[PDB]
Amino acid sequence: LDGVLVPESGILVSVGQDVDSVNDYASALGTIPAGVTNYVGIVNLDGLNSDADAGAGRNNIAELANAYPTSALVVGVSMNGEVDAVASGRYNANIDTLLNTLAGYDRPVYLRWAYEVDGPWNGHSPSGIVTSFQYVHDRIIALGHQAKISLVWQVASYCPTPGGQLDQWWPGSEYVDWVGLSYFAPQDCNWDRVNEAAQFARSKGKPLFLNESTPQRYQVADLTYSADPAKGTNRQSKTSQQLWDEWFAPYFQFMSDNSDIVKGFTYINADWDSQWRWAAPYNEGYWGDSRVQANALIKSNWQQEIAKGQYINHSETLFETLGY
Ligand SMILES: O=[N+]([O-])c1ccc(O[C@@H]2OC[C@@H](O)[C@H](O[C@@H]3OC[C@@H](O[C@@H]4OC[C@@H](O)[C@H](O)[C@H]4O)[C@H](O)[C@H]3O)[C@H]2F)cc1[N+](=O)[O-]
């Protein structure tokens, strides 16, 4: 796809990853985000045309798209543990409806198909990922939606999964418009996973989207950090400048260090602790509170950074800038 829906220059600023947290961000920052992010499952299309709230914030792409009619949509599509049945065609009617629905919004859509392709917890087979990316990239063309829907192959870039295993998941450059990654606690392995994902994207000639990012294990309102990924115990006080310097400055530095390929990010701005999947007593890891508006210094510094001219923010020229 040769730069289609990929900005020639600049980094798309998007926010996620549930309707309410995105509305709260837009309210608190007094801004219309350039891109907004939700999730849907392919088995039920849960979250596409009506509310789906399963403990990770409310998803409703119809509501989101009406609330932000001149912002890009970013959509994570879960395989719901069924990628092999998806690859064998059992959900093909649902795929068409998903693609036709998203194309009916007449705006740039970034589709993270089977996001975190190499996260073992997603139950994926390499075959099912390679086949289904082929099928979906081709179906976008068959349905006539290739000017509108950009297909993102997003890895998990998660330190406990060993490096050097990305090739088995790759469907081929002809079937991928962007590579994506997750930027949470890359310091746990010296940035090795996120750097490996970036260098993979670079080697394939694809732009890079940081599709999931948050100061994982930090609390912005409380100003704390924990080294405990499972339960968030023995929380450490941080100053707000420390929390900026420890997570936010390196996050933006990573984008500069990879500025040949980085063309978008999604910042997840949420009180994760308020959402039951991510809440105490932490059955699915410790996440924290990533709301930049919950600290004045973090909020100022955030707004000051993303207003800079390497970032693509919302304006009347946004869709043109993104290649729509
Ligand atoms: O301490 N940690 O390092 C830690 C511990 C756990 C943890 O949990 C995961 O958090 C990220 C979240 O994205 C994962 O969510 C799983 O996604 C897969 C789901 O699969 C469903 O399982 C039920 C099945 O019937 C259905 O077919 C299938 O789709 C699963 O439900 C989710 O739990 C968590 F697993 C993260 C971390 N860490 O962050 O620190």
Ligand SMILES: *[C@H]1OC[C@@H](O)[C@H](O[C@@H]2OC[C@@H](O)[C@H](O[C@@H]3OC[C@@H](O)[C@H](O)[C@H]3O)[C@H]2O)[C@H]1F
């Ligand atoms: C990347 O790391 C951070 C996690 O928060 C992300 O997990 C996704 O968070 C948002 C949830 O809405 C999504 O949950 C899926 O939503 C669609 C449902 O059909 C599906 O059952 C549900 O798991 C999380 O995967 C992670 F990607």
